[PDB]
Curated annotation (Swiss-Prot), chain B:
The gene is Rnf213. This is E3 ubiquitin-protein ligase RNF213. It comes from Mus musculus. It is found in: Cytoplasm, Cytosol; Lipid droplet. Disruption phenotype: No visible phenotype. Males and female are fertile and produce normal-sized litters. Mice do not spontaneously develop Moyamoya disease, a chronic occlusive cerebrovascular disease. Mice are however more susceptible to Rift Valley fever virus infection. Mice show elevated expression of MMP9. Belongs to the AAA ATPase family. Monomer. Interacts with UBE2L3/UBCH7; UBE2L3/UBCH7 is the most efficient ubiquitin-conjugating enzyme E2 for the ubiquitin ligase activity. Interacts with UBE2N/UBC13; promoting 'Lys-63'-linked ubiquitination of target proteins. Composed of an N-terminal stalk, a dynein-like core comprised of two catalytically active and four inactive ATPase domains, and a C-terminal E3 module. The ATPase regions do not generate movement but rather act like an intricate molecular 'switch'. The RING-type zinc finger domain is required for the ubiquitin-protein ligase activity. Atypical E3 ubiquitin ligase that can catalyze ubiquitination of both proteins and lipids, and which is involved in various processes, such as lipid metabolism, angiogenesis and cell-autonomous immunity. Acts as a key immune sensor by catalyzing ubiquitination of the lipid A moiety of bacterial lipopolysaccharide (LPS) via its RZ-type zinc-finger: restricts the proliferation of cytosolic bacteria, such as Salmonella, by generating the bacterial ubiquitin coat through the ubiquitination of LPS. ATP binds at G87, V88, G89, K90, S91, L92.
Amino acid sequence: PKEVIDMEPAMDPVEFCSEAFQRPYQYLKRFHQQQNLDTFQYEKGSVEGSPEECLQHFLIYCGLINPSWSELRNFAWFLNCQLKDCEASIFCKSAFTGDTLRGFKNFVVTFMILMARDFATPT
Amino acid sequence: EEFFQSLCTRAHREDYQLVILCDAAREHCYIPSTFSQYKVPLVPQAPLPNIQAYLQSHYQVPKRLLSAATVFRDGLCVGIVTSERAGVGKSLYVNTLHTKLKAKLRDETVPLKIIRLTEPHLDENQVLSALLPFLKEKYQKMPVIFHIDI
Ligand SMILES: Nc1ncnc2c1ncn2[C@@H]1O[C@H](COP(=O)(O)OP(=O)(O)OP(=O)(O)O)[C@@H](O)[C@H]1O
Ligand SMILES: [Mg+2]
């Protein structure tokens, strides 16, 4: 993907409309710029993103320099399972009912970047 | 050698075009040594894009034929999906051509035969044995993609 982002979209769009790429991109798009994460995400549909922009976010947040597509797929699916577990648990519900829990999902996504660097990143 | 000698003794057409090609650095063996008087010192070679255009001109499937090649690069019947480093886009690309053959020519039911070749010193009997129960049937002469994976 690094060699078709300077020369040449490239990612398969059936993966772009998949849940497994869209939910991590719907969090990383709101996470790149420092927007507030209080409002709820994943309304089960694709937001206005492009394959170029979500490819660029996955290239800049996976950590390693020249990845293959398997490694970005593993990174995105790991973030998918973790944010799906974050959406299935009641900590976002208790954040909605308590209103002093917020800002914890920046910690959540950053610490999955570190654990994902442990799991899905040699070199 | 003695059989070629027998055929040139008995009876043969004297307009025949027999060409032999051997590795030049393996000359101490039998057949390039005992045919050395018919040595042709030019070694005919064509350039690369001429060979590419020749093979592509014969691989070009004509229209109105109901081929699976119409979802490849406008009917070329043979492709090779290669890459320098492994694990990038190849099998998903083959799957996108298979779903594109599912889109055009509706009511698809089209076979995607996958033939994983995973043994050293490639055995053609494996590929032949995987292909014999398949197009000896006459109802699978509908368009099928085959994906040999060396
Ligand atoms: N362009 C792409 N965009 C997104 N995901 C992709 C892309 N290409 C491949 N993938 C993902 O990568 C994984 C494996 O891809 P694929 O089977 O095409 O790789 P490959 O090049 O054939 O692999 P290998 O050389 O290991 O056999 C799958 O999960 C697939 O969804
Ligand atoms: Mg593959």
